[PDB]
Subunit: 643 residues, 3 copies
């Protein structure tokens, strides 16, 4: 990128543990020391200080005055960077980029880079109390940046050096208000802005002095961004002297406007579009949170095939890779900070939360997929206080100071009083409800929504979490709460899918959660270490039957799915064979004999007298078919039921 | 794949020779120490004991109970594997996968793997008497396999741990009878089966207990497999515990039925499809048999262009890569064991042949291209025995016990009595005939076939070997047996191609051989160390005129080939210019003047009066043209005739 | 390629300087020690002796007789190759391939290779007096070549070992006159020639004795080569023995014929096609001339988008990568030797130019893009002598002995007398003019051309250099010579582009230059170390407004460009907004308000009264649009004018 050089420093590390809990080991980044114990259900996970260290050569610039920066893409939870013995920087918060100018700590030839990382609790730390593992370490990798003396800003909250506000115009075009930030500007430097259309062709440009960089650029005939058509432009910014580019940065951006109203729900680009989707944690089976770029895009593609149009990226800042995948595949994204569960008093905990929100907005400001900033999750679990409420006003004020182009949101714990000072702080609001799993009946969800909506017709209500555990080796002919069966989780989501389709004024609903994820503290349903409320398993391999409920309710590609394939052995004179489809007519066959034809909306239930022995079940929708094999048995195996 | 990990161990080996024939060398697998002396004509090839050794790091499973296996893809001919000095396993037979569980012999960190390979004869060994170099060493590569304690079986005759039997159903679907094999099954483990269509979409599924894994899965509207349309399905098997896959394995398979009848020949999926093809050895110029996956696919592609629809994979188990290429590209494959030439009596020789066949079947059961198991080649060269006959009955019974879905076959040496105990053992039978090369006249082939067919109307007769040496620096105007010319080899195959077209009741015919191959004992026709009966040279570069004979008879894409280009200088008032085409009318031009137009079936002979000096011969078929240059000389060069 | 094995030796080098100007450094090829100081404007560049040194392993051939060559792709400007301390060869000339047979200097295992390179002047050296940096070192890389004892010639002038002369025939075909050159030919070796068509299919073949290889091969229905449709054939040659390829070389070639007449200009394949294009140097920003293959193709792609159909590759032999890029992308290439500015008298200098010319023709004879051999550039700067004129006639004779199929050309310095001995030597002739930049006025160019053509109606007149410096931080409301402004360089090329469009009898015009390039001696217009006459900056990143003039005049894809975006702040009651387009009607809008509509040929000038503040200038052509932002100011910045 012009004279800017980015060198990956992911290889060649030794991880030591000063308190001796593990022998030294050589590792490659991305890395966490909790990749296994953070989700194997041993009972705990190692929280402590791990020291990473490696050697690097000092990068060299052709021209005098070069500068060297180390870029950590995340250090969970607390970090100190040393070059050749001397502290270069410290950082708190384990989900955001931070950088350090290590120019003057560098010598020619080999240098030593030392990063102390701690995932231990501290008086100012968030997260501290949550239902998910705090994987320690350098789980996103580390970069070396070489730039000339004049270069776009690398020092401001790990930001990109450029902010872009695209807006549609009445005449069918778009304005891109752009500002970039130059370290050591000077009258001999300009900033040349160029905008490239989705196909790579330049469509607009403008030029500014390097010390006065704000400009608004107009693109005619703009291709708007939406979840269905995520059209992207590329803003390129070049720091120029004479006929030479010194620095170059760029940003993918999208043009969209959007509204949420209490009676109307969500609209984007003037079209009513109810947000129906999922939440997603950042871990994977025995990798901890140390995911590759392929991991992130694979998650995104699975969620796209589901037919979701929104993703709540709880409970922290995610990878640039996953925001990139959202911009490109088209999802409405809710991004949030880990201000979770239990308010911690003090100036330092207040400073942590504000800094983390400042980094979340500045590092992710250019992503068109991000529509909502979330300021807390379930913060009343630890009890309300005046101090806690003031922090939420401070955070609301910061989001509108930093970014008035986006809506603020909040996720309430289930028992949050439906009046009180926690409402009307943010532009929109959501509740985390588990009626039918942690308490109550499934049939309570609908009336709860209707009642709150009627009593608060000025609040935009969404559901930021709802869900139910499903452990796919348990299977019940009489599925009920706390049997943990795949069938009961499907019944829960059968109701909710239809509940949210009945209520477009719910601006967004988010299944908790897309995937099973790791929580060291969990033990229930015969499994340790896990939240198993996923529509898909933690290794991304197995779609539960709940997944196909949503696929039939959301996806447009024709599909037909026979539920209960893992209920392989069925006892009884008849058994219910359930089919999900986005077609409206399903014919079921059993060993070639027609069982029946039904016309229904999404869910189809057939009573089937299985033949003795093995049975081919074939469901014929319109252009799609499905087929599974079931076995009639006298008594179903002991292993289909929790001990 | 789930928690299964396969690591390539092809790098960083040291090859030593205990008896001192060579200095120690560092090698990379695939490797044979006979890559040069096995085909360079020096006189002999080194048969001895080579010792390979390298270090490897112990792989780590995230959960407790991890197991480690070493996988040797092939070791020619006899091997002993040691880990840290201790013997892990021994294996006899040089063409098939074997594995050892080395868990208890591994320590943390670096381990030492040592493999002692011998290609010397033993009282047990097959091959022992054949016309091809027994290249020695680790010529397919080595893998390391990490698996959890519960995993698909790794210990059974080097197999994949799954067997899949697809059959077409009457209503246009397919049943897949699947059985998988689990080491340490358990009530908490299930096997989840999934079937993907050629385009990667799931079309059917079933689930089973891990100690009772057999299931039949029906796929509607199945896409059938044939040599013209090799549609493949993927069967995936996952070992599942709760919401987590422990192990995963998979098999590409095709849906086809087929028949051979003595009068009707070969049918596949209901259509009479005479099998007309070639054999193929597994070596390549100065590589020995240490071929890469690209080499195998290159061979497959060259055979596909030839228009061949069957490949005889003589005389041993070939690479998985090549069976994969036959499944993907579509060839009817005859697969066989090296039970060749001279029968060795003794219980140990018996065990060898029985186990090599068992490995052949279990390691290749899932390939749809394999249609025929061949139990022996030319086994009466060493005289018939009652032990010999009984071993053939044992192999026939073994083949039908392990795999009733395929047909057995045998290749008789030319002088085998057409009556007697070697007939009616296998389902179909072939002969190796060389009338017109090893004696006899070309014109006896046709009558011989018709006499056998007329006398043994209950036998399905094929021709597994026929061919003729062709060395392309020798050229003759009066081509005759033993001048070794390219022209005589073409005349031989001109006749044979037409003979097999006339006889659809020959179930299969295989040219010996597709490529020149290495045999260290050969010395004839002015060349040492080669069998030069190939249609294509041993470096895969030059197609002989014999190749284009078969292309014209077999290939569907229009082509046209002027023969005799390497007969560059022609003497005589007229010279014959021969053209091969799969179009039916050829106009020949000589320096732009029209020489003749003919309508013929495949073969076109023109008598041409060449102008003095150089002549442009252009042949014009319907939509294609060919062009070569010839020179008119007074005396042809001495270098065109064997000395 | 058969038994030929090409190994790159670009890694693992140490570079020392005997005279101690620098410390020892390890380097990778391609490399030059003048990568930075040759274009940073410090004042000078290091011309000394650098000694590169690495160790390599002797390659092994499977048969006795193996040979080892070292191939240096270029060494600027003088080199000596040693293997294990023994001189293998010496070379003069910094831009052509040279090889050494090092078979006998080699021992088994590790050997040491030393290459002393010096870029200082010598009595025989060209280049010596020129406006570009003589970057020193191994700026194209080094190869090791292993061949059998019989192989295609590696010892004749760095040549490819084969020459191919394709010519179209009247019946729509093509003849390929082929000669290859075999070292240690022999009666058992034949050369087998094959011609593959653009799509990889063999269309023609011939075979020859290896002591007598010349042959003409006819291809029917030939696909012609042209700049618009650069169809390429592949000629393949194989050294064959028995059934085994010993060596293999190949060449990509194209079929074209072309003419130049004084009154008709240039024609290719019978269609008049004026050559309008650019020159190109081989350096890039702080890379010196150590360019990668991507750098070469990137330059070619940029020139293709510009719409040029001709590239003058001054002032030396360029890399094979770029000649390939011109063969593949389609440009008429003028290639030349660095016989520039000042004639050196004496026999060694004369030998230098004759040998460098010979290397140019032999190494590039097969490239269909090359149409013109250039013998000298501006050679009368140092005065005419009898000996200069003689050396020019020697070069003409050498060109027509080596290559009668191409046209010779020459580049005259501006003041070269329009009569006399420097004219009518070569087939065509060019002048380097800079009327309007080094003197005179822009409007003199047109009349000059018309006077020469009137006076010399038998000379084919081209313009091999013209241009004007443009430094893009300088902007002027009254552009004039020596303000160095982007606007004035644009005015220049606006006139010149229309000048050559008006004169199709100019056979070729070449803009000096396509890119800015490095000249250590230069210091002017506020920039040091640079010739800044490029249409595009030296880092390939920024197209000057001059670039879009030529794009409008040459390119076919619709485009529209508002000039002067870097004149970003504009003073005056009105400002001129200039637009370039290859559409003929442009509507300009200022902040949504129409300013005017014009129908012009390529260049559009609008007088705009800007609004106070920021202004959106949008230009609407037929199917394309352009948009830029301008600011109205009272006083334009100080930094738009040279101090
Ligand atoms: C999205 C966004 C990105 C920003 N990036 C930068 C930046 O990279 N560099 C910078 O100096 N200021 C940046 N700013 C602006 C600063 O917030 C503000 O102008 C001023 O520097 C106050 O800095 P403070 O937050 O340290 O008080 C950015 C502002 C926003 C909203
Ligand atoms: C194609 C094929 C693959 C087989 N793979 C296995 C296997 O992986 N593990 C196993 O225990 N049996 C496997 N079997 C079946 C065995 O033959 C079976 O265990 C048999 O009853 C035991 O006989 P044996 O142990 O003497 O071979 C396979 C059978 C076939 C036909
Ligand atoms: C394009 C071209 C390539 C040539 N390549 C070779 C070659 O590789 N080897 C060779 O012996 N001659 C080659 N020649 C021809 C030589 O000029 C020829 O051998 C000549 O008689 C040698 O003369 P010399 O030894 O005085 O240079 C080539 C000629 C041309 C025009």
């Amino acid at each position: 990128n012009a004279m800017r050089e980015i060198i990956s420093l992911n290889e060649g590390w030794t991880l030591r543990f000063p308190k001796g809990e593990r022998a030294a080991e050589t590792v490659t980044l991305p890395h966490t020391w909790n990749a296994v114990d953070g989700m194997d259900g041993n009972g705990s996970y190692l929280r402590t200080t791990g020291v990473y260290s490696r050697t690097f050569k000092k990068p060299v610039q052709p021209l005098t005055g070069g500068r060297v920066y180390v870029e950590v893409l995340a250090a969970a939870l607390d970090a100190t960077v040393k070059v050749n013995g001397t502290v270069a920087t410290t950082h708190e918060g384990g989900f955001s980029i931070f950088r350090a100018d290590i120019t003057d700590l560098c010598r020619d030839g080999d240098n030593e880079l030392t990063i102390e990382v701690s995932n231990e609790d501290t008086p100012s730390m968030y997260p501290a109390s949550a239902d998910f593992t705090f994987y320690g370490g350098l789980y996103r990798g580390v970069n070396l940046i070489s730039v000339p003396n004049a270069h776009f800003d690398l020092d401001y909250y790990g930001g990109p050096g450029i902010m872009v506000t695209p807006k549609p115009t009445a005449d069918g075009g778009a304005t891109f208000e752009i500002k970039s930030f130059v370290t050591n500007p000077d009258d001999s430097f300009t900033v040349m802005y160029s905008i490239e259309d989705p196909y790579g062709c330049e469509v607009a440009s403008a030029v500014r002095p390097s010390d006065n960089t704000a400009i608004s650029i107009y693109v005619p005939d703009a291709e708007l961004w939406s979840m269905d058509e995520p059209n992207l432009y590329t803003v390129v910014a070049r720091l120029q002297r004479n006929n030479e580019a010194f620095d170059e940065i760029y940003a993918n951006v999208g043009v969209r406007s959007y509204t949420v109203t209490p009676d109307g729900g969500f609209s984007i680009n003037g079209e009513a579009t109810p947000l129906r989707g999922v939440s997603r944690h950042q871990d994977k089976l025995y990798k901890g949170n140390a995911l590759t770029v392929e991991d992130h895009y694979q998650d995104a593609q699975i969620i796209k095939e589901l037919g979701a149009n929104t993703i709540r990226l709880a409970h922290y800042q995610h990878s640039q890779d996953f925001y990139d995948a959202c911009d490109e595949l088209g999802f409405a994204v809710w991004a949030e900070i880990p201000f979770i569960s239990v308010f911690k008093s003090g100036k330092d905990a207040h400073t942590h939360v504000m800094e983390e929100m400042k980094e979340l907005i500045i590092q992710n400001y250019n992503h068109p997929s991000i529509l909502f900033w979330g300021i807390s999750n379930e913060i009343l679990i630890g009890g309300i206080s005046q101090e806690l409420v003031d922090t939420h006003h401070d955070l609301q004020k910061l989001c509108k100071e930093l970014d008035p182009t986006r809506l603020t949101t909040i996720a309430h714990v289930s028992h949050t009083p439906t009046s009180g000072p926690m409402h009307r702080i943010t532009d929109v609001e959501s509740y985390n409800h588990y009626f039918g799993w942690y308490g109550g009946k499934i049939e309570q969800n609908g009336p709860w929504l209707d009642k709150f909506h009627a009593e608060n017709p000025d609040i935009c209500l969404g559901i930021s979490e709802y869900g139910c555990e499903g452990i796919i080796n348990w299977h019940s002919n009489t599925p009920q709460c706390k049997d943990y069966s795949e069938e009961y989780q499907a019944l829960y989501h059968e109701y909710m899918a239809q509940a949210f389709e009945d209520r477009p004024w719910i601006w967004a609903s988010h299944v908790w959660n897309m995937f099973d994820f790791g929580c060291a503290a969990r033990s229930e349903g015969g499994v340790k270490g896990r939240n198993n409320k996923g529509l898909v398993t933690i290794d991304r391999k197995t779609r539960k039957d709940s997944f196909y409920v949503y696929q039939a309710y959301w996806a447009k590609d024709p599909m037909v799915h026979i539920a209960g394939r893992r209920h392989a052995q069925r006892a009884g004179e008849t058994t219910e064979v359930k089919v999900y489809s986005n077609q409206d007519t399903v014919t079921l066959y059993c060993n070639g004999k027609e069982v029946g034809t039904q016309t229904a909306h999404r869910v189809f239930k057939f009573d089937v007298a299985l033949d003795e022995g093995f049975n081919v079940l074939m469901a014929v929708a319109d252009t799609v078919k499905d087929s599974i094999t079931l076995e009639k048995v006298e008594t179903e195996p002991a292993c289909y039921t929790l001990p």
